[PDB]
Scaffold this active site. Structure first.
Site, PDB file in Angstrom:
ATOM      1  N   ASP A 103       0.825  -1.199   0.000  1.00 20.83           N
ATOM      2  CA  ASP A 103       0.000   0.000   0.000  1.00 20.83           C
ATOM      3  C   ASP A 103       0.858   1.247   0.000  1.00 20.83           C
ATOM      4  OD1 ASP A 103      -1.914   1.938   0.276  1.00 20.83           O
ATOM      5  OD2 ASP A 103      -2.452   1.440   2.358  1.00 20.83           O
ATOM      6  N   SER A 145      -0.498  15.470 -12.247  1.00 14.81           N
ATOM      7  CA  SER A 145      -0.730  15.077 -13.615  1.00 14.81           C
ATOM      8  C   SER A 145      -0.976  16.311 -14.469  1.00 14.81           C
ATOM      9  CB  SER A 145      -1.925  14.119 -13.675  1.00 14.81           C
ATOM     10  OG  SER A 145      -2.348  13.909 -15.006  1.00 14.81           O
TER      11      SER A 145
END
Length: 330
Positions: A35, A199
């Site tokens: 994770d 992004s």
């Protein structure tokens, strides 16, 4: 040193991925959920409330000759999906795909929430975010990667998740046969303890690319892709019959649909998520309404590049003094 381990989807939907981890002496092998959105290595154990164990493999520290109770240490964690666990702490030898750390904090669960109990395939979590998020008190502990870093050939790990198929976590090297083209690297903020990056935009299907900054985290422990409501609305508008359902808890779509791809930007590069990756199947057994793999982050407080996004790429988690993220197509 290096390590290399196969990671396997837990079910036919890729709801999560498990990776075998050796703990203790002799080894006890547990299948953990790697994770990158958390920083605790915790396990179902011999100390876990009996009623809260249902099929998981447990760590028994009394059977490990290298286990040592970390005196006074406790832990307690709550995850974005509302699940939680807590317990006490041992140090022991932990190996992943041939890479061994001695004195790793192994957090032994005394309590786990129902969603963990109900998932027989996950024996615990292995956190790979930054150690600043580790919940051990009163002395915060380091992640497996942090402990291994200095010994690694290169201070990196890579995530190569499969679509409906096994993949790989590598530690300490970049497998140049595992991706196509080049790896594009992008800046990381560690200010919130996550692999947080920005992004450069998105496209829906064969549509034009929208240049826009989307700040989010690279999180192998989250199943879906969570993005701003504007982005998500634009995607599902291209699917006939799709709608946001408050009763289901997100966007659903007719199971008869062909989903468009979704592209996200990494610098000047582009990662394409095939439409099939965005299908998470009937909302309930037998239903013709299917659950979407792209959902709104509104009210999460953060955008999450979860498995839906990451499994479309070869992803480099670069833990150099100034951390960065790399993405390649594959």
């Amino acid at each position: 040193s290096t390590g290399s381990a196969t990671t396997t989807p837990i079910d036919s939907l890729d709801d999560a991925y498990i990776t075998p981890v050796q703990i203790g002496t002799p080894a006890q092998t547990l299948n953990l959920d790697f994770d990158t959105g958390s920083s605790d290595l915790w396990v179902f154990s011999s100390e876990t409330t009996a009623s809260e164990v249902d099929g998981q493999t447990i760590y028994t520290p009394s059977k490990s000759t290298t286990a040592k109770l970390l005196s006074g240490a406790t832990w307690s964690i709550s995850y974005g999906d509302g699940s939680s666990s807590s317990g006490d702490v041992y140090t022991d030898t932990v190996s992943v795909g041939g890479l061994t750390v001695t004195g790793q904090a192994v957090e032994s669960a005394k309590k786990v929430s129902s969603s963990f109990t109900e998932d027989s395939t996950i024996d615990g979590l292995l956190g790979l975010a930054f150690s600043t998020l580790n919940t051990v008190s009163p002395t915060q502990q380091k992640t497996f990667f942090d402990n291994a870093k200095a010994s690694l050939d290169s201070p990196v790990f890579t995530a190569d998740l499969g679509y409906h198929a096994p993949g790989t976590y590598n530690f300490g090297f970049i497998d140049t046969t595992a991706y196509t083209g080049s790896i594009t690297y992008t800046a990381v903020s560690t200010k919130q303890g996550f692999w947080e990056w920005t992004s450069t935009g998105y496209a829906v299907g064969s549509g034009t690319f929208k240049s826009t900054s989307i700040d989010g985290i690279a999180d192998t422990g989250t199943t879906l892709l969570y993005l701003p409501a504007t982005v998500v609305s634009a995607y599902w508008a291209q699917v006939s019959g799709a709608k946001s359902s408050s009763s289901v808890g997100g966007y659903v779509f007719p199971c008869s649909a062909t989903l468009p791809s979704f592209t996200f930007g990494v610098g000047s590069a582009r990662i394409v998520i095939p439409g099939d990756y965005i299908d998470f199947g009937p909302i309930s057994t037998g239903s013709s309404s299917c659950f979407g793999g792209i959902q709104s982050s509104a009210g999460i407080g953060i955008n999450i590049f979860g498995d839906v996004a990451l499994k479309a790429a070869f992803v480099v988690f670069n833990g150099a003094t100034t951390p960065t993220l790399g993405f390649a197509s594959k």
